[PDB]
Amino acid sequence: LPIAEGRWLDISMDFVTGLPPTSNNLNMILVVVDRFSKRAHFIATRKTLDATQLIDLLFRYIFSYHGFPRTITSDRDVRMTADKYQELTKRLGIKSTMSSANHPQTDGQSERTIQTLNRLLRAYASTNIQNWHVYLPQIEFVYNSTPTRTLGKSPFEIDLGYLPNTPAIKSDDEVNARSFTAVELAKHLKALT
DNA sequence: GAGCCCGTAATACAACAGATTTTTTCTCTTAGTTTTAAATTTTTATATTTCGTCGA
């Protein structure tokens, strides 16, 4: 699919199920992957919270509070083939670009994130049933800070510039400790783009 | 060629592809039922076993 845009104007998301319940939360995987920077957010949820009517859009917007996208790529799921979802996205100026009747490879990068997520979920899933909903933000923070392979830079520092706290600045420069005056961010952030 | 060390660095290969209940015999395990044979008495002559005691 088209390569990249201005910091996740193209985006992907998908669902996987089979997760064990903790508070009647047996979906808990609404993974949204910031395709350009591969920031790859995923927020806990459930099947019965919404069906794209009341609360699904609300945490979709609290994710989208950090920037509206311009293109979705998703599956033929009933939570996104509804008339309510397509029309609201059209009024938002954001395309749908659904899948092709059990062809999840259109959502490949989100599903590849899930494949990376599942291993880390098993790593952090010792307390499988009792209390583990605190681990998804932990898995997010670990996975974003870890450098990938296809780009050589961690997806956290690709968009935000700097790395998270406890600086372990590499031997390139001090440029990854970019937390200072913001009027010159545009030039080098476009260079990183 | 010929190989070796070591230090980087490419490199095909595979996982994400809704998850769960059933379906049909089998095989330990563990608790409830059923039929039946057996623990203490008389007893009667027979015999052998094994104690138990006594004797010069």
From Swiss-Prot:
Protein's UniProt name: Integrase p58
The encoding gene is TY3B-G
- All copies of the Integrase catalytic domain together span 1-163
The stretch of residues making up the signal peptide is none
Which residues make up the binding site for Mg(2+) 3? D14, D75
